């Protein structure tokens with residue numbers, strides 16, 4: 309039957325399908341083409357995607373996310389132990405050193421492996437595709453980070469099987485993005501491709517070489533805790549200090565609701581500032597019946613996050629340095645990840661590459677799913 313490509317992302321997931329001999333990226337029921345990689349369990353239901361993410365504050369112990377940071381890893385891994393201190397859900401050690409997520413669900417304690425959480429997300433991507441295409445779907449390519457090891461790959465395949473998918477192949481995220489732009493069929497001889505992938509919570513840079521249409525991952529670098537959320541945090545912080553300055557030292561972070569509402573509008577302000585030079589936050593009855601409003605300029609946003617945005621160019625230097633390649637030798641710079649929409653981030657990268665135009669014609673948070681789907685179709689016939 310038909311085959312699909314799924315980007316199983318750390319914070320968002322995305323699915324591509326084949327209609328009329330081209331690739332369609334599938335909207336979810338919110339009209340969005342990316343679905344949060346969130347699941348939640350209550351006494352009467354389980355929620356996936358936006359619904360799960362939206363109720364996190366009301367049910368934080370049973371709202372699971374970041375499963376991609378556990379999948380295929382061991383419980384006493386240092387990264388795992390570090391991440392566990394920032395998650396409100398419980399993780400305990402299963403037999404054979406396997407992490408187990410423990411939550412409450414339908415009135416009982418329930419245990420899940422990370423691949424079981426990821427299977428739910430994959431099942432959602434499968435369902436929305438089935439509605440979109442009007443048929444049952446089994447065959448899929450699923451993407452993973454280039455640095456994922458054999459155990460992380462197999463656990464991703466298992467998440468596939470658990471969701472009822474026949475995973476024809478697990479391919480690398482940066483390669484899928486390269487495939488989406490046809491880069492393996494563009495020009496003569498050897499082609500050097502840099503993938504710059506800045507998301508909600510992770511940053512990955514990958515340097516690939518293509519020859520005779522064959523992909524080799526030459527070098528990877530990045531930061532697994534830099535992305536869009538950190539930029540949101542900086543906007544929040546600014547607003548908190550502005551509010552004190554206006555209201556005799558009153559701190560808004562003391563109230564939870566005021567923070568959620570503020571964090572919600574900061575995210576929206578950040579998005580708005582990718583296409584406008586000004587954004588407004590205005591929230592009635594924010595803290596102590598105190599109303600709050602502020603005008604935030606793009607320049608101010610760029611200023612609050614200046615260190616972060618400069619820090620994204622260091623992994624670009626590391627992959628090039630590690631591969632013994634000059635930045636001049638890169639033929640395609642590909643922007644992937646929703647945070648690449650930030651004009652300043654695009655300007656920094658373009659400046660680093662001496663004014664070269666990036667490949668950005670495909671939505672950067674859809675490029676991976678797109679390439680996955682091309683590959684699914686090739687493997688499918």
Ligand SMILES: Nc1ncnc2c1ncn2[C@@H]1O[C@H](COP(=O)(O)OP(=O)(O)O)[C@@H](O)[C@H]1O
Nearest residue numbers: 317318319320507508536579582645646647649
């Ligand atoms: N227009 C925009 N301007 C700035 N940031 C954006 C915009 N659209 C999406 N983002 C950011 O993209 C991030 C999600 O990226 P995505 O690539 O979907 O995540 P993942 O890393 O899981 O693949 C979020 O932080 C979101 O705020």
